Amino acid sequence: IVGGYTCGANTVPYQVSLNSGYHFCGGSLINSQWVVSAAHCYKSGIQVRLGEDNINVVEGNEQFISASKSIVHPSYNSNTLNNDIMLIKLKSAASLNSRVASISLPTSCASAGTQCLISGWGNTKSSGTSYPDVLKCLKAPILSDSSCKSAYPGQITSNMFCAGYLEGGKDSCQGDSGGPVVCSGKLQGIVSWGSGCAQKNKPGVYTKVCNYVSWIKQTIASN
Ligand SMILES: NC(=[NH2+])c1cc2cc(-c3cccc(-c4ccccc4)c3O)[nH]c2cc1Cl
Ligand SMILES: [Ca+2]
After folding, report:
1. Is the sign of the CA dihedral 186, 145, 87, 197 positive or negative?
2. Per the annotation, does 54 bind a ligand?
3. Catalytic positions?
4. Which is catalytic among the residues 84, 102, 176, 192?
5. Which terminus of the chain is more exposed, N or C, with fewer CB under 10 A?
6. Any known ligand binding at 201?
7. Does the CB atom of residue 191 touch ligand 1 within 6 A?
8. Domain count within the chain
9. What distance in Å separates the CA atoms of residue 51 and residue 198, rounded to the nearest whole number?
């Protein structure tokens, strides 16, 4: 997160860190046994780390659980990043409390102008790499479809939306990949891609979760 602030320990209880010996992507807890992240974060040997704040210090509240299976969307296109969503089933269920809690899936899509909270342990520099130890947060609005397509002509599908600041300075970045975009307490987006981080007129593009609710529910129901 570039231009964001320190969230404060456990103030984003649904945030998870996907770990393979280091933090490589974020994700969101949607029930005690399933996490939603981005398809491009897929790899084998993933350990899901819940209740984290400082990812390099065990401070208490952490629950480290191995992923039993990862289900990348069948129509995921790695070249366009269309359908960039993945579900991860945990080997055992997590214990939910106040520090670890799941976030709700939306019933409707959000409108432009909705203010959302994006969080993660991704890069904090737009020019260079600086990865933080604790969780960063950023409040950002969903942009209109016209502004989004004007910024990324020919690359936005109906399963994507832009959120951010066209002036640059505040944005999500690499490492935040796979994590949550929550608006009015519902998970509306997944950090997917963008041109650089916090660059002028190049907002972040997020997977539009409201288009995948039936898929998520049917898939969980059958696994
Ligand atoms: N808001 C933005 N401007 C933005 C920037 C990046 C940058 C990345 C990214 C860059 C390099 C590698 C990965 C990556 C690839 C495989 C696994 C994990 C991360 C990224 O997600 N993802 C991003 C998503 C967003 Cl919205
Ligand atoms: Ca920790």
Report:
1. negative
2. yes
3. 40 (charge relay system), 84 (charge relay system), 177 (charge relay system)
4. 84
5. C
6. no
7. yes
8. 2
9. 28
